[PDB]
Enzyme design. Structure first.
Site, PDB file in Angstrom:
ATOM      1  N   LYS A   1      38.867  49.498  36.676  1.00  0.00           N
ATOM      2  CA  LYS A   1      37.555  48.787  36.157  1.00  0.00           C
ATOM      3  C   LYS A   1      37.163  49.520  34.717  1.00  0.00           C
ATOM      4  O   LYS A   1      36.534  48.802  34.052  1.00  0.00           O
ATOM      5  CB  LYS A   1      36.626  49.190  37.018  1.00  0.00           C
TER       6      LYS A   1
ATOM      7  N   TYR B   1      40.684  52.956  41.493  1.00  0.00           N
ATOM      8  CA  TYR B   1      39.788  52.014  41.131  1.00  0.00           C
ATOM      9  C   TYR B   1      39.009  52.061  39.903  1.00  0.00           C
ATOM     10  O   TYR B   1      38.940  51.021  38.943  1.00  0.00           O
ATOM     11  CB  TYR B   1      38.866  51.859  42.258  1.00  0.00           C
ATOM     12  N   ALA B   2      38.526  53.266  39.773  1.00  0.00           N
ATOM     13  CA  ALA B   2      37.842  53.608  38.234  1.00  0.00           C
ATOM     14  C   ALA B   2      38.634  53.415  37.076  1.00  0.00           C
ATOM     15  O   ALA B   2      38.355  52.777  36.026  1.00  0.00           O
ATOM     16  CB  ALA B   2      37.192  54.864  38.653  1.00  0.00           C
ATOM     17  N   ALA B   3      40.122  53.712  37.268  1.00  0.00           N
ATOM     18  CA  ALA B   3      40.802  53.497  36.301  1.00  0.00           C
ATOM     19  C   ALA B   3      41.167  52.017  35.818  1.00  0.00           C
ATOM     20  O   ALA B   3      41.032  51.638  34.598  1.00  0.00           O
ATOM     21  CB  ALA B   3      42.417  53.993  36.540  1.00  0.00           C
TER      22      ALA B   3
ATOM     23  N   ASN C   1      38.362  37.614  38.872  1.00  0.00           N
ATOM     24  CA  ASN C   1      37.412  38.406  39.695  1.00  0.00           C
ATOM     25  C   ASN C   1      38.270  39.203  41.077  1.00  0.00           C
ATOM     26  O   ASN C   1      37.647  40.111  41.516  1.00  0.00           O
ATOM     27  CB  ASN C   1      36.722  37.219  40.140  1.00  0.00           C
TER      28      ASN C   1
ATOM     29  N   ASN D   1      48.344  34.578  44.450  1.00  0.00           N
ATOM     30  CA  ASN D   1      48.420  36.027  44.553  1.00  0.00           C
ATOM     31  C   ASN D   1      48.746  36.411  43.070  1.00  0.00           C
ATOM     32  O   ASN D   1      49.761  36.460  42.266  1.00  0.00           O
ATOM     33  CB  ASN D   1      49.822  36.372  45.189  1.00  0.00           C
ATOM     34  N   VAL D   2      47.564  37.230  42.449  1.00  0.00           N
ATOM     35  CA  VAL D   2      47.721  37.607  41.067  1.00  0.00           C
ATOM     36  C   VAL D   2      48.472  38.572  40.889  1.00  0.00           C
ATOM     37  O   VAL D   2      48.932  38.907  39.835  1.00  0.00           O
ATOM     38  CB  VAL D   2      46.292  38.184  40.418  1.00  0.00           C
TER      39      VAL D   2
ATOM     40  N   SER E   1      33.128  47.225  36.831  1.00  0.00           N
ATOM     41  CA  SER E   1      32.284  47.612  38.042  1.00  0.00           C
ATOM     42  C   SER E   1      31.468  48.742  37.386  1.00  0.00           C
ATOM     43  O   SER E   1      31.847  49.617  36.445  1.00  0.00           O
ATOM     44  CB  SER E   1      32.961  48.177  38.949  1.00  0.00           C
TER      45      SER E   1
HETATM   46  N1  LIG Z   1      30.844  43.727  45.812  1.00  0.00           N
HETATM   47  C1  LIG Z   1      30.506  45.139  44.933  1.00  0.00           C
HETATM   48  O1  LIG Z   1      29.830  45.989  45.182  1.00  0.00           O
HETATM   49  C2  LIG Z   1      31.186  44.941  43.534  1.00  0.00           C
HETATM   50  C3  LIG Z   1      30.925  45.931  42.713  1.00  0.00           C
HETATM   51  C4  LIG Z   1      31.368  46.011  41.493  1.00  0.00           C
HETATM   52  C5  LIG Z   1      32.584  45.245  41.223  1.00  0.00           C
HETATM   53  N2  LIG Z   1      33.115  44.465  42.261  1.00  0.00           N
HETATM   54  C6  LIG Z   1      34.201  43.538  42.055  1.00  0.00           C
HETATM   55  O2  LIG Z   1      33.772  42.189  42.142  1.00  0.00           O
HETATM   56  C7  LIG Z   1      35.109  41.649  42.407  1.00  0.00           C
HETATM   57  C8  LIG Z   1      35.248  40.771  43.720  1.00  0.00           C
HETATM   58  O3  LIG Z   1      35.137  41.409  44.794  1.00  0.00           O
HETATM   59  P1  LIG Z   1      34.082  41.241  45.960  1.00  0.00           P
HETATM   60  O4  LIG Z   1      32.950  42.221  46.069  1.00  0.00           O
HETATM   61  O5  LIG Z   1      33.759  39.650  46.084  1.00  0.00           O
HETATM   62  O6  LIG Z   1      34.941  41.548  47.111  1.00  0.00           O
HETATM   63  P2  LIG Z   1      35.589  40.500  48.315  1.00  0.00           P
HETATM   64  O7  LIG Z   1      36.802  41.640  49.103  1.00  0.00           O
HETATM   65  O8  LIG Z   1      34.737  40.146  49.369  1.00  0.00           O
HETATM   66  O9  LIG Z   1      36.544  39.425  47.630  1.00  0.00           O
HETATM   67  C9  LIG Z   1      37.619  39.649  46.893  1.00  0.00           C
HETATM   68  C10 LIG Z   1      38.439  38.289  46.943  1.00  0.00           C
HETATM   69  O10 LIG Z   1      39.518  38.684  46.104  1.00  0.00           O
HETATM   70  C11 LIG Z   1      40.580  38.413  46.913  1.00  0.00           C
HETATM   71  N3  LIG Z   1      42.133  38.889  46.435  1.00  0.00           N
HETATM   72  C12 LIG Z   1      42.391  40.310  46.619  1.00  0.00           C
HETATM   73  N4  LIG Z   1      43.806  40.408  46.465  1.00  0.00           N
HETATM   74  C13 LIG Z   1      44.125  39.168  45.796  1.00  0.00           C
HETATM   75  C14 LIG Z   1      45.229  38.817  45.063  1.00  0.00           C
HETATM   76  N5  LIG Z   1      46.406  39.782  45.108  1.00  0.00           N
HETATM   77  N6  LIG Z   1      45.374  37.616  44.717  1.00  0.00           N
HETATM   78  C15 LIG Z   1      44.339  36.769  44.628  1.00  0.00           C
HETATM   79  N7  LIG Z   1      43.139  37.162  45.300  1.00  0.00           N
HETATM   80  C16 LIG Z   1      43.177  38.615  45.769  1.00  0.00           C
HETATM   81  C17 LIG Z   1      40.431  38.486  48.232  1.00  0.00           C
HETATM   82  O11 LIG Z   1      41.286  37.743  49.116  1.00  0.00           O
HETATM   83  C18 LIG Z   1      38.988  38.125  48.370  1.00  0.00           C
HETATM   84  O12 LIG Z   1      38.863  36.517  48.565  1.00  0.00           O
HETATM   85  C19 LIG Z   1      36.348  42.531  42.605  1.00  0.00           C
HETATM   86  O13 LIG Z   1      36.951  42.571  41.304  1.00  0.00           O
HETATM   87  C20 LIG Z   1      35.591  43.647  42.780  1.00  0.00           C
HETATM   88  O14 LIG Z   1      36.241  44.998  42.179  1.00  0.00           O
HETATM   89  C21 LIG Z   1      32.276  44.152  43.405  1.00  0.00           C
END
Ligand SMILES: NC(=O)c1ccc[n+]([C@@H]2O[C@H](COP(=O)([O-])OP(=O)(O)OC[C@H]3O[C@@H](n4cnc5c(N)ncnc54)[C@H](O)[C@@H]3O)[C@@H](O)[C@H]2O)c1
Ligand SMILES: NC(=O)c1ccc[n+]([C@@H]2O[C@H](COP(=O)([O-])OP(=O)(O)OC[C@H]3O[C@@H](n4cnc5c(N)ncnc54)[C@H](O)[C@@H]3O)[C@@H](O)[C@H]2O)c1
Ligand SMILES: NC(=O)c1ccc[n+]([C@@H]2O[C@H](COP(=O)([O-])OP(=O)(O)OC[C@H]3O[C@@H](n4cnc5c(N)ncnc54)[C@H](O)[C@@H]3O)[C@@H](O)[C@H]2O)c1
Ligand SMILES: NC(=O)c1ccc[n+]([C@@H]2O[C@H](COP(=O)([O-])OP(=O)(O)OC[C@H]3O[C@@H](n4cnc5c(N)ncnc54)[C@H](O)[C@@H]3O)[C@@H](O)[C@H]2O)c1
Lengths: 239, 239, 239, 239
Positions: free
Chosen positions: A149, A145-147, A80, A53-54, A132
């Protein structure tokens, strides 16, 4: 193989982009630790799932020490894990704000403040932060979220400077994905997802492997003269 | 291999970055045509040298048609040929201005206006332009060069849009190298070189292979969702 | 007044943005020389029209010397003259390319290489280059124009460095306008004006005075600590 | 005068840049409210000092409502309050992280979530966020600060989009100052001040008024077609 003998930690590695990145690294010989709140949704002999849990500072220290105890060092870190809690700013609650900053910004700090200095001391590492397109362009309904990223880009540049001091070969970069279908988009109306696809030069959303391959490039020594950068992987989108 | 079966053209391929890029591609299964004014300074079973002067419009057409006649198509183009003619703007001559714009900007147009639309019609390609840290930051004594290397970014973005029309899987990106050990740095005083290294986060100049590996990434399908971008490969430099 | 006692040269000053900038300066106490191919479409007690073709090197020197002989010095320069010759890259002719680079890039150099060093010698100046949203984002059918307007940013950064060497208080910046309702944009079909407007955060196109007020800011001492910058004046457009 | 009839709120208004901005606005006819933890260090008939702690959500609402009750509306908001708690990331404490994010990022949200929607509903406003060169380039020993000042750019772009929806003439921009001679910088060793100055094209640090003049430009209708932007006011600095 590209990452043979390297130890890589991926936060949020149970599914989505984190899964894709973990698998890409593992297929290139890395010893991967995928930390997440949830159990891994997949198996690979060189991916170990761990609870992480980050946002829990004490828990992050325990995770870090567990990885060091078992694997000896951490060569690659992908920060990530991330969430959204979308709302127009007029309606956004304190809890929606707080949770997103805590995972997406503080959670990056919480683990990097351990891993990054360890890389500097070892004289080697590669850190990849996940920003992002929303951090690069802003987006309606996503001030929190924007803040975070955009903030990650500030961390990226700062750490690229700090962790390379005293001749340490440590690189720090960010990837700013465009839209990729994962569970993070569960609340985003399809009308918007369709608009986002049309805003790309390639007229399509991305696939998780398209982010993973860039993460593999940056983790590897192929990117040995790339540091301090945010690479947009977004099909040419302007949002 | 990453580029197996692809046909790649590299302008300025006789030495320097062009040579490094050619060899990286050749080692990944591409058939490489290295176009240059000079004879190649190296050999490889997958690299063929051809005379190319990017400033001679008629000759560029002849070169292009020769490559199409031999291999049927061009999948990858690297617009790498480039020169400097440095001078403070106070002293810069018309000839110093004209020559640099002609090679570094018009020369890019001269060949790309043939290759890029061919990629669009074929439905596939990857174009890599070579910008420079100087195009991103400017540099004293280099207004001509800076204009061209910033200009190349405008070309990159425009073509990433144009050549992907009608569903074509054509990507266009730029690499902006920092200071890399090649012959183009012959005329730069050594004291300024040392200064340049100290302006990087890694405290060193780059090697040609460090650019070639990024060119390989962008040419390949690993970069399938990367288009319209300028990737700085500069050790974290601010100039 | 903001520019009281200053001498300003505006290229392309007969109409459009050049006219608006000239009038804004003339209302703030500057003596303005509006250089253009055509006769001015307006008059003002503080605006003198002079013939200027920025592509004729010999004529640019004659213009420059005439202004210095009359006015003694030039404190402010706005490099505003510009043209388009639009075409898809696959059809763009050598003349369409050449004309646009000659006006929009070389023309800027031709006059600035005289004026900028003169400002440095005199210890004071402000130069404003006119880029475009097209230089920042690219645009289909405008590879030539995009190359020039991106290139102007490279010039801007370089000259901000060069002309402030050795203690000289010379600033150099660019404005990148969005789509502004000059004569030329008044002809375009309303359906398409609506389209460009919809890409802006303010959902409207700009007026020439909205560029002029920014040019006034940058020319004035209000912008005394702003140099090397490109200011987007585009209603928040992403193109 | 430039801001005659307008109501402006400046956070962190007791000293430093906030003071300079408040006075610049007051001299151009604005009715100014300077909110801060401490008493104002200056007087002006059109600046009212009020207690404001941007980190106290409840107090922020009370402050906001007090201003609305007395002044009727808020036309201009400058989110200037900010702190540093510098440390290398390897030594940075949770408290050093937390406090900087709370003031510099959450504090911006806490008040803007009231003021911004009010501007949207009124149909007019201008918001100026204060970023930093550190948010644009990163800086050693300032990961927390850099995260916040980069994050503010994310907020800026998001709110420029959100608050201008439905035809509302609300602009949102940021100023990223370089190193400006407020009270703390004056205490740094001269050697270091010279070093910082040498990173700028003008070879000097800035004065507070040089930020205030840009804040006045952005608050005013002179910037009517400028929104979503971050203006660097840094003497041409690269950090
Ligand atoms: N999918 C998109 O369109 C997109 C675009 C830009 C950026 N992102 C970024 O990519 C990254 C991954 O997101 P994703 O799209 O795979 O979404 P996702 O929801 O499928 O996966 C996110 C993962 O991070 C986890 N997580 C959440 N809170 C946590 C915590 N406190 N401790 C540890 N793990 C935690 C979740 O349990 C999950 O397994 C994120 O940082 C997201 O902001 C995604
Ligand atoms: N080495 C660096 O530090 C650095 C940094 C940034 C960008 N670049 C650039 O990378 C590119 C390659 O430069 P390099 O460092 O390898 O220099 P180089 O001088 O070693 O090689 C340049 C090659 O381009 C060829 N060339 C020149 N004019 C030509 C023409 N009209 N037609 C065809 N070929 C021509 C040359 O003959 C030569 O082989 C250039 O575009 C240059 O601007 C180099
Ligand atoms: N209007 C827009 O939407 C827009 C947007 C971005 C950038 N720009 C740029 O703003 C500048 C002004 O454009 P405008 O819209 O006012 O166009 P315009 O065509 O109305 O006016 C341009 C003026 O430049 C002059 N000019 C052309 N060639 C010249 C030469 N060789 N020497 C001297 N003068 C010359 C013309 O005679 C004309 O008076 C241009 O650089 C243009 O590229 C305009
Ligand atoms: N001076 C520079 O070189 C520089 C450069 C870049 C950015 N900045 C930024 O400009 C802004 C102003 O900086 P400054 O140099 O004038 O600093 P300063 O320390 O002189 O003044 C900051 C003011 O904001 C205040 N403040 C702190 N916490 C607050 C809170 N919780 N609620 C209300 N007010 C609070 C202080 O009481 C103080 O009056 C800051 O955001 C800052 O980080 C300054």
């Amino acid at each position: 193989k590209k990452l043979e003998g390297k130890v890589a930690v991926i936060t949020g590695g149970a599914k989505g982009l984190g899964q894709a990145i973990a698998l890409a690294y593992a297929e290139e010989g890395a010893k991967v630790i995928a930390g997440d709140l949830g159990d891994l949704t997949y198996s690979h002999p060189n991916v170990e799932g761990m609870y992480l849990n980050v946002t829990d500072v004490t828990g992050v220290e325990k995770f870090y020490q567990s990885v060091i105890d078992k694997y000896g060092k951490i060569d690659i870190l992908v920060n990530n894990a991330g969430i959204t809690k979308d709302a127009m700013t007029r309606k956004m609650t304190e809890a929606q704000w707080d949770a997103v900053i805590d995972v997406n910004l503080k959670g990056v700090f919480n683990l990097t403040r351990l891993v990054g200095p360890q890389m500097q001391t070892n004289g080697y590492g590669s850190i990849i932060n996940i920003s992002s397109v929303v951090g690069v362009f802003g987006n309606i309904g996503q001030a929190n979220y924007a803040a975070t990223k955009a903030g990650v880009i500030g961390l990226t540049m700062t750490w690229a400077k700090e962790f390379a001091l005293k001749g340490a070969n440590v690189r720090v970069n960010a990837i700013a994905p465009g839209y990729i279908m994962t569970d993070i988009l569960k609340t985003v109306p399809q009308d918007l997802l369709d608009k986002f696809a049309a805003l790309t030069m390639l007229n399509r959303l991305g696939q998780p492997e398209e982010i993973a391959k860039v993460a593999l490039f940056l983790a590897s020594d192929d990117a040995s003269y790339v540091t301090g950068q945010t690479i947009n992987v977004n099909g040419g989108m302007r949002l």
